[PDB]
Amino acid sequence: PFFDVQKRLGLDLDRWMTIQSAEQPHKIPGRCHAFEKEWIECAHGIGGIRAEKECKIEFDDFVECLLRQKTMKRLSAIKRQRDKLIKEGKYTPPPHHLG
Amino acid sequence: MNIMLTLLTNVTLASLLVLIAFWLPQLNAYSEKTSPYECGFDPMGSARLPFSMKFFLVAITFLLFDLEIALLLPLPWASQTNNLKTMLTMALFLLILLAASLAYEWTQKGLEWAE
Amino acid sequence: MFMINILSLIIPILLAVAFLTLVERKVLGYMQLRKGPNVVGPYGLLQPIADALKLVTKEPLRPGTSSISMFIIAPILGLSLALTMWVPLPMPYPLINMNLGVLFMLAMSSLAVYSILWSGWASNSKYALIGALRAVAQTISYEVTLAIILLSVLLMNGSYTLSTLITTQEHIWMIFTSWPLAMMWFISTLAETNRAPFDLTEGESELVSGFNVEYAAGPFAMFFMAEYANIIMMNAFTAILFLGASHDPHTPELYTINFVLKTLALTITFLWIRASYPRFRYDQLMHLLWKSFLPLTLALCMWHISLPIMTASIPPQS
Amino acid sequence: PGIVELPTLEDLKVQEVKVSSSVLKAAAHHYGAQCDKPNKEFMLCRWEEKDPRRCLEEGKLVNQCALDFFRQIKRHCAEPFTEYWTCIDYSGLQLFRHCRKQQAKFDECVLDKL
Amino acid sequence: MNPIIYTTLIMTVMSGTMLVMISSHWLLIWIGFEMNLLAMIPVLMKNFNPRATEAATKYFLTQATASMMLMMAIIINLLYSGQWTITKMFNPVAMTMMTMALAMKLGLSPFHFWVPEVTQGISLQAGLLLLTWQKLAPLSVLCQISQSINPNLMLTMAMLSILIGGWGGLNQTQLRKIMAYSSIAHMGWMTAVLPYNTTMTILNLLIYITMTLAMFMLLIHSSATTTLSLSHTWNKMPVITSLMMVTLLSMGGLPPLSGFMPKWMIIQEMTKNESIIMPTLMAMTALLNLYFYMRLAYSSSLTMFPSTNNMKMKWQFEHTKQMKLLPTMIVLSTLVLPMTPALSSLN
Amino acid sequence: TMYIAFILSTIFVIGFVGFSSKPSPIYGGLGLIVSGGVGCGIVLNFGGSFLGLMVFLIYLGGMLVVFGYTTAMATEMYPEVWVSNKTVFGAFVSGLMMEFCMVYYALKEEEVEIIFKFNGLGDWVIYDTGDSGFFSEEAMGIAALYSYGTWLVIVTGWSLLIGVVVIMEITRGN
Amino acid sequence: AGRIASFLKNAWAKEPVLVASFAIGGLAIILPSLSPYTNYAIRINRATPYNYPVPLRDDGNMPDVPSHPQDPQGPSLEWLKNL
Amino acid sequence: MPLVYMNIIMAFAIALAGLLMYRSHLMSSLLCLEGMMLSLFIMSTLIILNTHFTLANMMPIILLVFAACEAALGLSLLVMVSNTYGTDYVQNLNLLQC
Amino acid sequence: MWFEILPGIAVMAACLFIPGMATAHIHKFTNGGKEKRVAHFSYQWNLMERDRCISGVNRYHVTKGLENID
Numbered sequence A: 001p002f003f004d005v006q007k008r009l010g011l012d013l014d015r016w017m018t019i020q021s022a023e024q025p026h027k028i029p030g031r032c033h034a035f036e037k038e039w040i041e042c043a044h045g046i047g048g049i050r051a052e053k054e055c056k057i058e059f060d061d062f063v064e065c066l067l068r069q070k071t072m073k074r075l076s077a078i079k080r081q082r083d084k085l086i087k088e089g090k091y092t093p094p095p096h097h098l099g
Numbered sequence B: 001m002n003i004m005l006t007l008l009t010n011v012t013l014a015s016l017l018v019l020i021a022f023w024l025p026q027l028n029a030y031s032e033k034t035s036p037y038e039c040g041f042d043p044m045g046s047a048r049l050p051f052s053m054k055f056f057l058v059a060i061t062f063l064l065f066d067l068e069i070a071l072l073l074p075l076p077w078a079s080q081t082n083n084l085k086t087m088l089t090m091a092l093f094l095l096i097l098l099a100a101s102l103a104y105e106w107t108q109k110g111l112e113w114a115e
Numbered sequence C: 001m002f003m004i005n006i007l008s009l010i011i012p013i014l015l016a017v018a019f020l021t022l023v024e025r026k027v028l029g030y031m032q033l034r035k036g037p038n039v040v041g042p043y044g045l046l047q048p049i050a051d052a053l054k055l056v057t058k059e060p061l062r063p064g065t066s067s068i069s070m071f072i073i074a075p076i077l078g079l080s081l082a083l084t085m086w087v088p089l090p091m092p093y094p095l096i097n098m099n100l101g102v103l104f105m106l107a108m109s110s111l112a113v114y115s116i117l118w119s120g121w122a123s124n125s126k127y128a129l130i131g132a133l134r135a136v137a138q139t140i141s142y143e144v145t146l147a148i149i150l151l152s153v154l155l156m157n158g159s160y161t162l163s164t165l166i167t168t169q170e171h172i173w174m175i176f177t178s179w180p181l182a183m184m185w186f187i188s189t190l191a192e193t194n195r196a197p198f199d200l201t202e203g204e205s206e207l208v209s210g211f212n213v214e215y216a217a218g219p220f221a222m223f224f225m226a227e228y229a230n231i232i233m234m235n236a237f238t239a240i241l242f243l244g245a246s247h248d249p250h251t252p253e254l255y256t257i258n259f260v261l262k263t264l265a266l267t268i269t270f271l272w273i274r275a276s277y278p279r280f281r282y283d284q285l286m287h288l289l290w291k292s293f294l295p296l297t298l299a300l301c302m303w304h305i306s307l308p309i310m311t312a313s314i315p316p317q318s
Numbered sequence D: 001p002g003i004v005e006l007p008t009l010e011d012l013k014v015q016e017v018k019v020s021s022s023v024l025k026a027a028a029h030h031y032g033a034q035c036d037k038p039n040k041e042f043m044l045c046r047w048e049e050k051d052p053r054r055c056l057e058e059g060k061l062v063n064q065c066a067l068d069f070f071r072q073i074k075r076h077c078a079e080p081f082t083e084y085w086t087c088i089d090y091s092g093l094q095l096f097r098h099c100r101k102q103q104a105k106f107d108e109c110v111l112d113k114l
Numbered sequence E: 001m002n003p004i005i006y007t008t009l010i011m012t013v014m015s016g017t018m019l020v021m022i023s024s025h026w027l028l029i030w031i032g033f034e035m036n037l038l039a040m041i042p043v044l045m046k047n048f049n050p051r052a053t054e055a056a057t058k059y060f061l062t063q064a065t066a067s068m069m070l071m072m073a074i075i076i077n078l079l080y081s082g083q084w085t086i087t088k089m090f091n092p093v094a095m096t097m098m099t100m101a102l103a104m105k106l107g108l109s110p111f112h113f114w115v116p117e118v119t120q121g122i123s124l125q126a127g128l129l130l131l132t133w134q135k136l137a138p139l140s141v142l143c144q145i146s147q148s149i150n151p152n153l154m155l156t157m158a159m160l161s162i163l164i165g166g167w168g169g170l171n172q173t174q175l176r177k178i179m180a181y182s183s184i185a186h187m188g189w190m191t192a193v194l195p196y197n198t199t200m201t202i203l204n205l206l207i208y209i210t211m212t213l214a215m216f217m218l219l220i221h222s223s224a225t226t227t228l229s230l231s232h233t234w235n236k237m238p239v240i241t242s243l244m245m246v247t248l249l250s251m252g253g254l255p256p257l258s259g260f261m262p263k264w265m266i267i268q269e270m271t272k273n274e275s276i277i278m279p280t281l282m283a284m285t286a287l288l289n290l291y292f293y294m295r296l297a298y299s300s301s302l303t304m305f306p307s308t309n310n311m312k313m314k315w316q317f318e319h320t321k322q323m324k325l326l327p328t329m330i331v332l333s334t335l336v337l338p339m340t341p342a343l344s345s346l347n
Numbered sequence F: 001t002m003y004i005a006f007i008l009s010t011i012f013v014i015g016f017v018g019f020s021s022k023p024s025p026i027y028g029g030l031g032l033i034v035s036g037g038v039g040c041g042i043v044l045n046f047g048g049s050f051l052g053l054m055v056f057l058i059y060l061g062g063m064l065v066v067f068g069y070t071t072a073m074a075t076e077m078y079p080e081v082w083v084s085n086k087t088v089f090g091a092f093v094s095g096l097m098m099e100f101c102m103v104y105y106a107l108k109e110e111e112v113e114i115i116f117k118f119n120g121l122g123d124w125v126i127y128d129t130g131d132s133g134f135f136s137e138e139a140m141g142i143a144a145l146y147s148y149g150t151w152l153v154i155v156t157g158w159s160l161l162i163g164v165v166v167i168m169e170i171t172r173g174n
Numbered sequence G: 001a002g003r004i005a006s007f008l009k010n011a012w013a014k015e016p017v018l019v020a021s022f023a024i025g026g027l028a029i030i031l032p033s034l035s036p037y038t039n040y041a042i043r044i045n046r047a048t049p050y051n052y053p054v055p056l057r058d059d060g061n062m063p064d065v066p067s068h069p070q071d072p073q074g075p076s077l078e079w080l081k082n083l
Numbered sequence H: 001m002p003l004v005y006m007n008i009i010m011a012f013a014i015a016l017a018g019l020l021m022y023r024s025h026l027m028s029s030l031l032c033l034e035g036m037m038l039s040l041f042i043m044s045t046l047i048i049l050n051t052h053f054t055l056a057n058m059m060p061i062i063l064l065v066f067a068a069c070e071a072a073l074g075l076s077l078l079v080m081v082s083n084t085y086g087t088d089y090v091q092n093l094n095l096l097q098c
Numbered sequence I: 001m002w003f004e005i006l007p008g009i010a011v012m013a014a015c016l017f018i019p020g021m022a023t024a025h026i027h028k029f030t031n032g033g034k035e036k037r038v039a040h041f042s043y044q045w046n047l048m049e050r051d052r053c054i055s056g057v058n059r060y061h062v063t064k065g066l067e068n069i070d
Ligand SMILES: CCCCCCCCCCCCCCCCCC(=O)OC[C@H](COP(=O)([O-])OCC[N+](C)(C)C)OC(=O)CCCCCCCCCCCCCCCCC
Pocket: C175, C180, C181, C182, C183, C184, C186, C187, C238, C242, C273, C288, C292, C293, C296, C303, G014, G015, G016, G017, G020, G024
């Protein structure tokens, strides 16, 4: 905040909704709870400038968890390469994959 | 999905009832038959009759009340918290603010259908 | 088989509407020292059929100044909403079992206000639009009390699931716990279906027939079917909400008989109001809603939030 | 980067507990009473390790404990248990409150015989 | 309006601004902007003439469009980071969206068109509020996210603001439009140094708010909204016009007055970053603002325009109300240059 | 049945093109409520039952409804129609074709880079695998408004009361 | 004395709806803070086991954690059974 | 990102373009504003449900109520303009050029 | 007199009874003679999905007891 009234008065006005690894109702976990926790525990108290380079791996893992972009690419490659071999009559998917 | 089938059936049967209703009768239409009904004479178009700020004000006040109602709908699950005193304080707070909006509209003319 | 379920829900409801026309005419007649339909069939039992047949063979005059797209969309929306309002109703077991059934009904009935906003606008005539605007304002204003009353009553239910109402009312009716909200809810339901002293949009002696002047024969018939389906549905909702019937899982026919009888009683009361009172003025019903019903409804919502907490009588959410 | 290491298919084989949800629910209270050791031990492993692959043998012991629990039900009053879980199976919410008479004679079995 | 209702609406405007400045959460910052706009719209329409209604409508349209763009930027940022904390933006296009939204709220040059019209269309009190208090929230957000702004976009908008404020104000005979174009130029000066030193932005904002408060209170004291109406003020209260002249000279950044401090500090801080061409351009361009300030000073205090016969009536009357803190605002806007090293208190 | 969220989203964008080409405001409102209905369906397919029903009850039956009501009062002598302008047709057609081109490109390429990178590998693919237990996570998160969201309730209620006061200030007309 | 009684008289005679609504709202405001049962409602909400009660490892010196669900340790719902 | 997000962001872009490219009626622009809000609501809801950010489930409610308050304010402004000029045409809102 | 209104009321009563009875009997027919299982929450859905898998006939309502394994 521009004027950190919350940290001076000890009040929690909006910090409780600020991250998904904060305390949740019924302890329901965030989908990327561990990834966010690891990135936050890496980046804590070293400033944003340092945290941008020195916590790049944790933030990359977090971003992959949030938007599974590289996971989607790998799944798309497996799918489209499977079809690339159905046409030629090369690959037969096994019984547990067809029913 | 069962609900989608149900909606499809309802809409389809309503439209089929339209089609029978709006195509089956035998028709014979002339100009004076389909003339707009005005109790035996012709209507005046005039210029944008649906006016008066009161019709718009009731719509706006309904909109704001409906927004507060949207804020009140999660209440049945809100009573299932261990922190019941905070939840009760906030629910009653929202309802006092609803009552205050009603009272302020009431006292400052507001809800009145004036001259 | 589920399609058969949908059909065996829809078709009997339309038949019940058709014979509700006859029942309403006979109740009004006998309250007025006359008989009503007793010539066309035995005790007028073929009269709804005569009306339906005459209407679909009558020339449906469409206005020359009518946007026909919405002119035909409005009856489709009205009838589709009127029919789909029954799919979550817990005659013992619902057709569609949702967590938020009553929320679904609130939303669907709030979408039904478009059928008047579109019919009045489409009919042009520059005057039926004013009646349509009055009807829309009345409808949206009473939606407020419907929503808040439903909210306050359901704080004993614990959820928006309609099947849970049967469990909530196992030992006692919800009327004995919320009768003031029951009276306000019943009058709000009266006002929402444009019935009784609240029939301002179709005042027979105020604006002839209001938003339904230009509609004739077939589309008029479907609008009528939508309104009467909404009447029976609202009375069924009232019976399930306030007069919960005992349920035997091995004999659901008993619950169905109970529910049907109570729904018919409430519908007969709806027709009973029609024969007993003069008509509210538009500003008079708006004053009633905004200055009489709304403050008490807010106070009772407050009371019904406080009550389960201060008595350790909060229901389960499952 | 790196290979996600996976258990083989035969590292994952177990004698299944092949009874339905109503059968499982009918015995659930006595199941919790009698099978707490391996169940709590496996749940401890699962929350401590945050890894399905690290707790497979504990889950395999969970399965065996459930299996022997059910074989103990079978040999003394399989019949009252069968009636109780049938009555539980009828209702669409599998409610306990509609089956107290059958739960009664299931419960006064396991006391006297087990 | 009811005095209680007007006080409540003013307090709600300030509380929306404070919500913007005290929140760590983007949703609450957006809430503060929403609350500020909601309470601000009626104070624009306080007099209620078609000019006031049009000013309020244009203000509402620009501010609501900016608010929706800001929410979209927040949602894109959350989509890529899952973060609600106001900090560096983790997405570049979200950052661009947010920068454009905040500039439109401020009224920077490519989004400046609303400022002159709205300022002209509202009263002098409404304009005083519009050109002083409404700059705080977007500038505070910008100072919070300054480490992730695109310097090229921000500097482009600031330079355009200076140029357009200089050129647009050259053509004005209306005092409210002159104030609006001066405000555009000063916003450009504020936002040019924002990528480099937010303390300089805060300093320039404080100095500008002091000068604008002094000038608007002098205008309200004079009841003048056109340059010719102000040209009658010498024949009624020449002290007001002389004070206005020294204030206008301060606005032009003439040493040794207080208005020279922000320009001098910003030029120094920019040259510290190998920025020499842009400060030279900015200082040279500000001569336009100084030109139409000097035109106003010529018409108001340094020369005496023809008066009217009906002015003798006004001589026998005093002001019913007195502008609060106006002497302090005048002294602060002109005489504070020897106190410059105190700027480090803003660190 | 395999793709449901994609038809819903394409129809959503089509309705957006329809009402944002700006025919007479009654048809724009019709397009907006069609878009709102299909979007409520979209979030219903994602497990957001309460949120979608909120869309319905408050947006389509509230805010819209009020919008169409107010259009029915402040309109043209002959309230306009879609066809009356070639500009409406041009805008709608350009929007529809830019929808079709980009959905075809994304479907057959799965690596479009219009501002953002996109991959139409599916929409079910991103769903996570787990049990939510005996409650709706959405309802628990929203019911936390009264326990966790005290500040949010305070500011929203104040803004709504201020909204009533503000509307009554502006519309008085003096 | 007579002033407030007369005001209540006039309100009851001319606006009974507002009198009833304000009394009901006031009781809804006031009564929960005096109820012995509000704490009971809090306790009932606390005793509802939505989540799994994931166990702990007894490192020794855990004499108050049960071991078994039917050990004389850990909270008891006997109070709820009779309420 | 999945293609639903693509279409939702596309809807926001179309609503933004429709609002920025004006026509005669003010109500059409207000409807474009409403479309922008609706697309924001759906995008927020999808992001919040997908990542199971449970406490952020309430954020779409707040967005909806605040944007509807702004819509009420804009409707009142339109009504005042129409009472001035008999229409909501934006070309009548040009007397501040001088 | 008034009891001649009863025929129309009886027709209405039959028409209103048909939906509930039909729903109950269809639910019994398509769910193995038992009530249609209710899954308001993901735990109940998972119960039914487990029930379908172990039935061997891809029907959740075919209940395997202690006769299946033990
Ligand atoms: C410990 C307990 C704590 C809680 C206590 C709770 C409160 C108990 C006392 C309150 C009693 C009143 C409750 C609300 C009643 C209505 C409020 C109201 O404004 O009334 C006066 C209002 C207005 O009356 P008015 O016009 O005379 O007064 C207006 C205001 N003054 C006095 C200033 C002029 O009247 C109506 O609402 C009339 C309704 C018209 C329709 C009539 C229908 C008749 C048939 C009804 C049949 C039964 C219905 C239910 C059926 C079953 C449903 C399941």
